[PDB]
């Protein structure tokens, strides 16, 4: 691709420069080029990849929500322009998700590597299918929901066997999977049970953690608590 002539090390440094300049589209393109070199990503590199694409898709999701809301008032409450532009943003959002899912399938998800890396990429797969499900309809939405569930469930199986219940990656996965249950799969009971089990099993162990680990784990547990307050 366009990054094929650039050194992997130079792509990683330019990703870091783009982050400093808050140029997340550039940052994602640099990290995509780095992934396409075929070598595994370090923990630091995985997180650059995730931050880049999360910022890109995050802005698209936010714009889609703005436009869908304007579209919803203009339809039920009271020309084609709002729908057309919402469709434009939607197709761009789907394109980014398809890019990320393709990187995961072609380069990053594999049997090798430690449990942390395997969970991290399968959680990411579940997330980007979830973002597709947010905007999908009909038969396509049903397929996407099943794909999201399968990715999340395999990540859950690994994290439960291999990681402690306070591990931030395990917590963030359970958090996102519970949001999937509640918002996407219309399964509020399963969403509540998962978030509550996750919080409880983590709370039991917080007292054993260093200062720095305590911080990381409690930041996510607070998000679980936030949602549990909203759902109960």
């Amino acid at each position: 691709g366009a990054m094929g002539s650039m050194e992997r090390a130079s792509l990683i440094q330019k990703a870091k420069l783009a982050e400093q300049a808050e140029r997340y589209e550039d940052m994602a393109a640099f990290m995509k080029g780095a992934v396409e070199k075929g070598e595994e990503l370090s923990c630091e590199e995985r997180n650059l990849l995730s931050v880049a694409y999360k910022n890109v898709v995050g802005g698209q999701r936010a714009a889609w929500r703005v436009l869908s809301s304007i579209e919803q008032k203009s339809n039920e409450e009271g020309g084609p322009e709002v729908r057309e532009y919402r469709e434009k943003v939607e197709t761009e959002l789907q394109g980014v998700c398809d890019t990320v899912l393709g990187l995961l399938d072609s380069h990053l998800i594999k049997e090798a590597g430690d449990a942390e890396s395997r969970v991290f990429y399968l959680k990411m797969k579940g997330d980007y299918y979830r973002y597709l499900a947010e905007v999908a309809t009909g038969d396509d939405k049903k397929r996407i929901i099943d794909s999201a569930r399968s990715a999340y469930q395999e990540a859950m199986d690994i994290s439960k066997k291999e990681m402690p219940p306070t591990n931030p990656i395990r917590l963030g996965l359970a958090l996102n999977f519970s949001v999937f249950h509640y918002e996407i799969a219309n399964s509020p009971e399963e969403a509540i049970s998962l978030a509550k089990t996750t919080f409880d099993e983590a709370m039991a162990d917080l007292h054993t953690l260093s200062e720095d680990s305590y911080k990381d784990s409690t930041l996510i547990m607070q998000l679980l608590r936030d949602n549990l307050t909203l759902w109960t």
């Binding site: 997330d127 963030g172 958090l175 996102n176 998000l223 936030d226 949602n227 909203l230």
Partner: peptide, 6 residues
Amino acid sequence: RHKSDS
């Protein structure tokens, strides 16, 4: 809207 991992 819910909280997902940050």
